Amino acid sequence: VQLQESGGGLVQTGGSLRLSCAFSGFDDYVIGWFRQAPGKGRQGVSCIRLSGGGTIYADSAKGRFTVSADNAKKTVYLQMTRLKPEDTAVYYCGAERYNVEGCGYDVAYWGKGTQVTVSS
Amino acid sequence: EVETPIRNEWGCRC
User: Fold this and answer.
1) Which residues of A touch B14 (CB under 8 A)?
2) CB A76 within 8 A of CB A19
3) Which of A34, A45, A69, A73 has its CA 20 to 30 A from that of A57?
4) Does any CB of chain B come closer than 8 Å to the CB of residue A27?
5) Is A65 left (phi over 0), alpha (psi -120 to 50) or beta?
6) Contact at 8 Å (CB) between A52 and A28?
7) Which of B2, B3, B10, B13 is best to mutate for the A interface (most A CBs within 10 A)?
8) Is B14 on the interface with A (CB under 8 A)?
9) What is the domain partition of chain A in residue ranges?
10) 3-class secondary-structure state, position A48
11) What is the protein's quaternary organization (chain B) (predicted)?
12) B12: left (phi > 0), else alpha (psi -120 to 50), else beta?
C-alpha cells in the first residue's frame, strides 16, 4: 500500500488549490484529507469512499472544498477554494477501511504530507 | 493519529 500527496504551495487569500493523492495496493477503503498546523493535532477535512464516491466533509470544508476520485488514475483530489490563512497546514492523505460512523477513527496508512501556506 | 475525526450524524450507533 502507498499514498503520495502533491500540489502543495503558497496561495493568496481567496485563492484555490488542488491537491492530489496517488494511491496503490487496495477491499472497501476510504481516502481522507487531514491537516495539521505546527504543534497541533490532525484534523479531518474531507473523505471519499472509493467504492461509489460517497463523501463526508468537515463543517469548514462544506461548499468550498470538493473531494473526488478518479479510480482509473488511482488518484483522489481535494479542490480547495476561498482559502484563508487559517487553512495553512501540512495536508496528509490517509486510508482507512470504510466506517459508517465517520472518517478518521482508524487511519491505517498515511502519505508524506504537503505544505499549504495561505497569505496576503 | 487524528485529533478530530469527521463524525457521520446518521450512522449505526444510536
Assistant:
1) none
2) no
3) A73
4) no
5) beta
6) no
7) B2
8) no
9) 1-120
10) strand
11) Homotetramer; composed of two disulfide-linked dimers held together by non-covalent interactions. May interact with matrix protein 1.
12) alpha
